[PDB]
RNA sequence: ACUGAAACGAUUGUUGUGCCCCUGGCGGUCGCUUUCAAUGCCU
């Protein structure tokens, strides 16, 4: 009911939680760094049976102080609907790819 | 029904493996513990 559903003829409901795409306060050149990764054989080596694995690449990451100013907006909610959604804003803490390994963010309500 | 309603490019992954700040090197060379002295005075 708060974030919505669409089955088809069997029902749909519009999201009451409105939101926008958030932007870094500073520039990309100031707000990222690129980190190499590799994946060797368990025997500790990029070589197995005398042949090299192709498993190396760079990946791009946002930095540990970058701020994303955000307005999230909730239409026509009950009091408990506001506590559920405000709950999600304070209770969830990981975003983006590779959340098993990265991507913690602190949602400071202002 | 805003070309509409809901909408994670995601999952997993070690910049890794080996490596002697190494080799050679006289704290060395010269240098007087020196210079002067009554076992003395009387029996």
């Amino acid at each position: 009911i708060l974030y919505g559903f669409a089955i088809g003829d069997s029902g749909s409901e519009r999201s009451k939680v409105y939101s926008d795409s958030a932007f870094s306060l500073g520039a990309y050149e100031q707000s990222h760094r690129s980190f190499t990764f590799n994946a060797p054989f368990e025997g500790g080596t990029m070589s197995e049976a005398g042949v090299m694995r192709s498993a190396i690449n760079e990946l791009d990451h946002i930095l540990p102080e970058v701020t994303f100013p955000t307005v999230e907006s909730l239409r026509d909610a009950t009091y408990e609907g506001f506590i559920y959604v405000l709950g999600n804003l304070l209770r969830t803490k990981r975003y983006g790819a590779q959340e098993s390994r990265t991507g913690t963010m602190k949602n400071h309500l202002v």
Side-chain angles (χ1 to χ4, degrees), chain A residues 9-22:
Chain A
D9 294 90
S10 303
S12 185
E13 186 75 25
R14 283 176 178 104
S15 57
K16 285 161 203 62
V17 183
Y18 285 18
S19 194
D20 327 348
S21 314

Side-chain angles (χ1 to χ4, degrees), chain A residues 10 17 21-22 24 27 29 35 41 51 53 56 69 73 75 79-80 82-83 89-90 92-93 95-96 98 103-104 110:
Chain A
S10 303
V17 183
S21 314
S24 60
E29 289 69 42
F35 291 86
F41 182 46
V51 294
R53 284 181 159 63
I56 309 201
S73 184
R75 295 190 69 153
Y79 167 82
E80 298 101 314
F82 158 90
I83 297 294
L89 303 177
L90 305 172
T92 212
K93 291 192 176 72
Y95 301 88
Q98 308 190 0
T104 58
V110 175

Side-chain angles (χ1 to χ4, degrees), chain A residues 2 5 27 34 37-38 45 47-48 50 53 80-81 87 90 97 107:
Chain A
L2 287 163
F5 69 93
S34 188
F37 70 82
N38 74 37
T45 57
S47 322
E48 179 186 8
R53 284 181 159 63
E80 298 101 314
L90 305 172
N107 299 319

Side-chain angles (χ1 to χ4, degrees), chain A residues 40 45 54 59 74 83 86:
Chain A
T45 57
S54 60
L59 193 56
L74 172 59
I83 297 294
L86 177 59

